[PDB]
Each structure stands twice: as structure tokens, then as C-alpha cells.
Nucleic acid binder design. Sequence first.
DNA 1: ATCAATATCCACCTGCAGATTCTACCAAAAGTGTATTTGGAAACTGCTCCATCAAAAGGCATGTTCAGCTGAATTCAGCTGAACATGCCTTTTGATGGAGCAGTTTCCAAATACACTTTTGGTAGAATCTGCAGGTGGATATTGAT
DNA 2: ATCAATATCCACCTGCAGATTCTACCAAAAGTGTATTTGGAAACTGCTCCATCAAAAGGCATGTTCAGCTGAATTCAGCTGAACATGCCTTTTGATGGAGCAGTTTCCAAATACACTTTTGGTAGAATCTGCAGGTGGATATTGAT
Lengths: 91, 96, 95, 94, 108, 104, 84, 78
Amino acid sequence: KESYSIYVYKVLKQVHPDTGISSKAMGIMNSFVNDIFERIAGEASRLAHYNKRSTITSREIQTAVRLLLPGELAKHAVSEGTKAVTKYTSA
Amino acid sequence: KRSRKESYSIYVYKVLKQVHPDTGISSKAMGIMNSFVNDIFERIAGEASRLAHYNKRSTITSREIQTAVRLLLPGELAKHAVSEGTKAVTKYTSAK
Amino acid sequence: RWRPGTCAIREIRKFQKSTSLLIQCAPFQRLVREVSSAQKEGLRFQSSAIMALQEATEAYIVSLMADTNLACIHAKRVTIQPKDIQLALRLRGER
Amino acid sequence: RWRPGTCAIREIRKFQKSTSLLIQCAPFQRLVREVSSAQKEGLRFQSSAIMALQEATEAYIVSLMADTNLACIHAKRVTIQPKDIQLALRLRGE
Amino acid sequence: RAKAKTRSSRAGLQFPVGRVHRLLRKGNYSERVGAGAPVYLAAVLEYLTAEILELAGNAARDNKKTRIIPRHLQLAIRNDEELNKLLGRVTIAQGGVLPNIQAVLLPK
Amino acid sequence: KTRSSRAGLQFPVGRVHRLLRKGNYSERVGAGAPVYLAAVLEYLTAEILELAGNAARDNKKTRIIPRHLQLAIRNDEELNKLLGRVTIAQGGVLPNIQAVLLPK
Amino acid sequence: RKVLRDNIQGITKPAIRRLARRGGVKRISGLIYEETRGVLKVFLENVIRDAVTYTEHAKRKTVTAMDVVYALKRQGRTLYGFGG
Amino acid sequence: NIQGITKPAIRRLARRGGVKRISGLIYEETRGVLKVFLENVIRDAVTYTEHAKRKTVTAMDVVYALKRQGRTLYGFGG
DNA sequence: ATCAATATCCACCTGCAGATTCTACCAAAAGTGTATTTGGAAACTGCTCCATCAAAAGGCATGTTCAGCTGAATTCAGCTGAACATGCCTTTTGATGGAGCAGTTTCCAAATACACTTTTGGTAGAATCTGCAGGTGGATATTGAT
DNA sequence: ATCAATATCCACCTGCAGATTCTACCAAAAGTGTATTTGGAAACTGCTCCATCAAAAGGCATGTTCAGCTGAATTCAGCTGAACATGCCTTTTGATGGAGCAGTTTCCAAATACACTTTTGGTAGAATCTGCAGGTGGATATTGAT
């Protein structure tokens, strides 16, 4: 059975190299990641159906992020997403 | 350059003549009906998809529709709904 | 001369019986285009689409008025006050 | 001797600072199994599953208490009354 | 061959089981879709539409009109407990509201 | 060499790709969509972890517990707007006593 | 298009009075109208934000009614009567 | 057995909510509302389990039952 | 209780904007016949769950006092509703320009399906840290008397 | 406002038992590389639908008055709820036995997905009807003043 524990631990070592995290908080983190993934994927599927489109490109993810994140957060989120997409495509 | 699009208008009219043979219905109320049917269909199908995914199963049998109806409809609405659904399913399986 | 509150009570009956739009369509359409052009220049609207906005806003505000009036009845008054609206918005899980 | 409300206010700080379960676990499991057997007999429970119910019930009721207290502050009082609980549930869309 | 009777007739419904089947397949709910699911779902949809349409018809005739308009639908939904619990998060255009004045605001 | 490193992320783009395909969201799934989504998820997780870590510094502790997460979420505007319909086990609540109930 | 100015003046005081009378209110304080227009404008800004995002994703300059229905549904406010 | 939820426990829950003064008539409405919430949640959760053809109620069933009511809960698997 | 004065239902009539029915096509179900999955049945296998039992303890239930709080009763200044005169702007309706959709076709950049070959994160142990529960000592806050 | 005196937190230190962190391996995803389809982007274009634009009116908003009635402010008596002390028992914590399920694997009969070919019910106009909206007139019900 899969889980996001290791990647959350990697990000934690990125932003706080010395600090640890409890197991209960790890379960909180996994639950959060899955819930957010569910929100984004759901809005993306609905956006796909709304335009008689059968594929999901990163444009739909961008629009779903713009719809689900309120204001000050969506800008940073879109910036990091487009950054990752460009850095992945260019090389 | 004139197009076409499907809709539930005719079936809603059939049910209307079923329960009240004299009464008519306006076009706006018909649009209300279409939106309502589509909303309920979306709710039921969505809960059915979640029920399917929750058990590592990739198919949707009428069992999932029944349990979703039991989850989303409050009381006697769910009871009668399950009754009519089971009636229709048992009538369809016999292929008579 | 009508006593105060009587002409008001019988107003509630007419407006709770009717369904037509209680806001003039031209000023509501002016404001919608104001905000839409505030978010993006040169945007158009379907004639039906603006009707959708008016129904939703009217329904939202009507429900908010009913809940505010409930807050007033609970506070043992009849005159609604902004002290009551911010209570309703706080308990609706939206503010 | 402490004034009335003083021992209560400084209690509010205790419970708003702590996070442990505020309900005794034994009576809460007795009720859960009562209702569960009321809807279906012979059902078992994961130890983790019942802990989920206690957290959810505690959070729901705590939020309801805060909103009721807001209704009292608005009604210009401090003592919560059943007149206030039914107002909160009515404005909660419930 | 076997002369074709539609699935709606085999199930005894008014809603097309085939179209519901197509929406179930192409709707991105599950990869495969059973055979009794569209029958069951079309039956449920027919039942609920029959419910609200009967209520709206009676509410319309109580107003002495022979044609269902949105107001009749609003009255039919809001005067029932279960349907209102189902559609509490829904508003109906051209619908109006339920006539209800609190007893505190009435004359004495 | 992996897609996660090629994109500069910490979250596995392959896992997001598999979950997106097998999740019954759409018949076809683009190539940049899983990268984009994994990037957004990484950003938000980094946000909440930085906030919780800073709150743990304000509490002078070196291990993140649920209380730190609850305090970090409820003290922020955007995150609180995002998760208003969420409860956190072992979390507690924000210490707030109304001004009307205080002495003096 | 136009540098519009002061369209909130179009929401008249008696119009808000009528909306309140439909809501079942008997007596109204003068301070209500301000908060009313404020809440109305905030809600409108949210809904139009989401609708314009739907349109800009749809590669169009026109805001159809379905876009409004989606924008409302995102806020947990299903609306019937304009889906067709 | 719902009467087993003692008065001082309800007092503690209210004090966490920020309430200063509590009426005696509160406890009845309190236990009633709690009983309604518990009945709903257990109804949906037991339906989720009974659909999976099992006799044990896991925590994920509870999490789903709560999520259906618009009440996401983190800490037990989703 | 009466009585004048408005406001309100109820029915009726007619023209018409819209709902209904009738007809002619056509996209899509229905039917036939393969090819592919999959839920499910059988047999184990551990594994959490349930059921007792003891004991330490601290939370619960009871009862008593007392203070502050809430509901009742009163007053009144001011505010808001009803009215009326004034005038301003929102509604209907028609017509055009054209802009912006929809609809139609055509052709790749991208996605899918497989066949192998690596990489890895998941599971089960071995071996460290660190907030929890206390403890003092100091710093505040409360409560009561001058 | 001060001031002595508890009580109550707050700050810092401290040991340790329980989670925490670190290691050693592998089924199953993840990655690479072909053999193919395919959705969707690009380009026109047919054509609704939107946006202005005009203008009188008559319906409604605005501004001002006046009075009645409501919200705000005050007093206060009685009672309800908090605080506190008490003692008893219900809760937790630890430990066992074993039993009833979940969960894992394996192997098919049955159900469903595809690949094509006909048969229609459904849909979009054309051609018909037809309840409903306005507009009067009568008969009540409601409201306010004596």
C-alpha cells in the first residue's frame, strides 16, 4: 500500500533540515495531500467534460488551481506549476 | 449550421401525462426539470464511482446504484426509490 | 391614514406571493459589466447569462434577510440592524 | 474565595490550550455500540475507528458551542440557553 | 432474428436505459459499467420526477391553473420535508419564496 | 534522470500519472498535467510545513505535532479559507475568548 | 468599453426595501442599506471571478449562462432553470 | 445510556468553545443534538461497511461518512 | 359593537405568445457475434477484537452559599414608516453592424498499448532522542481592607 | 489608588519510556524504446446573438413632514449557576486467551467490452391550437375611528 510519507519528509528536510515530525502529523499530511489531489482532479475532470474534451492537459490543472485557491495563493501555485512544466519540457 | 442537442423533455412529459392527464407544463419548468434530472444523475453516478473505487473494484453494478441511493436520499424517498429500482431490475433481468 | 407597520405587513404578502425580479434590470446589468470589466477588459455577456446572476443574487440576499430577521427576533427586536447581519454571515459558515 | 466566572474563564484557557480528549472514553464507546447495534446487530469496531468518532463529535459540538455563545453575546447576555442552540442550528443551514 | 423491444419496455420504464448507459460509459465514472445499473438508475430518476411532478401539479391546481410554472415547483419542493432536505442547496429561477411571517411580527 | 528530478520536484510525477489515469477522471491524460499537479502539491506542502515549523519554534519544540498544524492553518487567511470544512485530530482550537466576557 | 462610475447608486433604497419585505422583515434600520450593498457586491465579485475564469479557459469573450451556473455550483449553490 | 455523557464533560466542551456561563436546561438540547449527529454518521458509516460485505467498521468508513456530510476529517487515512 | 373607506379575491373575456402535434430525416441504440476481464468461490493464515479481572486514582455526583445575572417593569428621545408632491430614469420595441461563436475539414504532436529492464519505496528488525510529567523559584493577577 | 497575601501561572531544568531514526532486502511501479492511433489545434465561414442607439412615457425613486411607536437606557428583586468541599465508584491501565474475520492466492463461469450492420425513436422545424395575461365589475374581508 502506497503513501506520501517519504516525499513529505523530503520537503520537510528541504524547509527545515533539523526538525522532525510525528507519526500522527504524518497521517494528517497524507490525508491533506490526498484531499487536495481529489479536489484538483475532480475540477479538472469537470472542466474536461464541459468542453467536449476527452483529455486533461496542464491548462485544465492551471484553471482548476485558479478556481480552487482563493487569491494570494493561486498566483504562487500557478507560478510554481508553470515553472516546473517549462523546466521539464525544455530539458 | 443548425445543430441538435439531446434532452429529457419528452420523458418528463410522458410522466406528467402519467400522473395528471389534464395538466400541462411550460418550457421554463421543463428546463427546471432537465437541470434537476441532470443534477440527480450526476450525484448518483458520482457516489457510485466513489463506491466502486473504495473497494478496488472497477465495475458498476446496480448494487452500487442501490447503495448510493440509500446514502443520498432521506428516508421514504430512498425506500420507494430502491423499491421501484429493484422492480425494474428484476423485470429487466428475466428478459421476458 | 394607515397605521405604521400595517402597510408594511401587507407588503410582505404581495412580495412573498410574486416571483418577478425585485431589482430593476438596467442598474443590475450596469454593475455586472462594471465588475466584469474590472476583472477583464472587453468582455461580453449572453442576454440569458445576466438573468442567471440576478436570480442567484436575489435568492442569496432573500435568504440572508430571513436569517437576519431571525437573529432580530432572537435579540427581542423587530428593526433589523447591521449588528444582526454580521451575526448571520458569521454563522452561515461563509464569513 | 474566587469570584464566579473567574475559575470558569481560567478554565477556558486550560481547555483551549490542551488537545487531549475531553470526553471519557468508556461512556463514549458504550453509546457508539448502542447506536451501531440499533442499526445493525453484531458489528465490530476498529480501535482507530471509534477514536475518529470522538474527535468529530468533539469538534462539531465545540464549534456549535462557540456559535451559540456568539448568539448570546448578540442577545446581550452571557448565559447560553436552548433558545440560542436552536438559533445556531437554524442559521447553520441545518 | 428476435424482434427488437427497447430496454425501457423490457424494464417497464419511461426513461431510455440505453442513453443512461451511454452517459455512464462516457461519463468517466468507472471503466466498465454493468447491465442493470442503467435500468436501476433510470427507474430511480423516473420515480423522483414523478414525485415532484405530482406535487407540482396538485400545487398548481390549488391555484386554479392547468399548467405547471416554476412557482408551483418551488411550492411543491418547499412544502415537503424530504424533497427540501434533498434540494436545500438549490434555488429555482422564477420561483419565488414560501409565504411565512413570524408570529412576533404579526398584529396583536 | 527521473521525471521528478527532470522537473525539479520532490513528488513522484509517475505516481500522479498512474493515479490520474486509473482514477476515472478522463480517458486521456496529458504529459505535463502530472508535472504541474505534483508541483502545486509540493508548493502547498512546503507552505504548511514552513508555517508549522515556525509555530514550533514559537513553542520551542523540534518535532511537529498536530497542534502545530492546527495553529498554523487557523492563523493564516488563505489556508483557513481553504480548509474551513476540515477538522484535525489531536488538534485543539485557537485560543480566543470573547471581549464581552472578560473582567474590567 | 467605458469608464463607468457609480453604478451602485442603481441599487435603490426602496429596491432593498422590497427585497427585505420578501424576506419577511417588518422594520428596517437606516444602517442596513450600506452593509446590504457591501455583501451583494462581494458575492457578485466572487461569482463573476469564477465565471470569467471559466470563460477564459473556454477560449471565449462571451460569458454564457452555463458559466454562471458552474461558478455558482463551485460555491455550493446549485441553480436550476438555465442548463438549457 | 446516552445519559452517561456526564454534566462536567459537557461543561468542559463548552469551556473549550469559549463559553463563560451555562444554563441548566442546556444539557438536554446538547445530548439531543449529539444524538442526532451520531445517528446520522453511524447510519452512513454502517451503510458503507454493509456494502463492502464485512462485519468490522474501519476508520475509513467513518471518514467517508463524514466527508459525505461536507465534513472532511484528517488523521486516519484521508 | 357599528360604519365608512380602501384593499383584496373571484370570475369572465379575448387576443396571442407560446405550448402541442404533426412530419421528415438521421444519429444512435438494438441486434449478432467474438474476445477479454473479474468478481467470486475455496482454503488457509495470521491478526486485531472481544471478553474478563485487578487495582490505583481521579473524576463524578451531591449538597450548600452566595454573588452577579437575567427577566420584568418604565420612560422617552429619536427614528422610521406612511403620505404627498416632484421629477427622473428604466422599459419596450426595432434595426444594423459586425463580432464573435459554432460548425466543418484536415493533418500532425502527443498519447496509448506493449515488451523488457531498472529503481524504489514498503516491510520487518536494530539502535537513539526528546517532549511529558514534575519541581522550584520567580513574576503576575485577584481579592480584600484602608 | 496602594498593599500584603496568598494562589496561580510562567520560565527554566531535568530524567526517561516510548516513539523515532536508521538499515538490509524485493514485488511492483517507473523508465526506455517501438508500433500505432487520435484528439484537438488551425483555417475558414455560415450565421446567430450581442451591442448600440433612439425616444416617450409612465412607473418609481427622492426628498420632506409628521407622528407614533420601537429601541435604548435604568432599576431592581429574585433566583440560578458557579465555587468548593466530600466521598465513592467508574475509568484506565496492564495482561491473556482465542475466536471470528479480513486479507492473500488461485482458478474459472459469467458478465462486459468491442467491431460492424440495421432499425427506429428523438429532434428540429411547420402547421395547429390554446391556456394565460391584462382589464372590468361585483362581492367580501380588513382596517381604522367613535
